[PDB]
Design a protein around this ligand. Structure first.
Ligand code: NA
Ligand code: NA
Ligand code: NA
Ligand code: NA
Ligand code: NA
Lengths: 30, 30
């Protein structure tokens, strides 16, 4: 339970992070 | 210890997300 829950939360956040870093990259260099 | 490691990574990532949104905000307004 706790481990599963936390890995789902981690996963979600890393998708958001990935997206945001790509958007930042775009804005700084284009 | 997988749980320990993941709680540290979660913490870090929430700070990184916050930081990046503030950088995006900054760049929109110069
Ligand atoms: Na568990
Ligand atoms: Na939990
Ligand atoms: Na642990
Ligand atoms: Na945490
Ligand atoms: Na806790």
């Amino acid at each position: 339970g706790e481990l599963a829950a936390l890995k789902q939360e981690l996963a979600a956040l890393k998708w958001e992070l990935a997206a945001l870093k790509e958007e930042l990259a775009a804005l700084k260099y284009g």
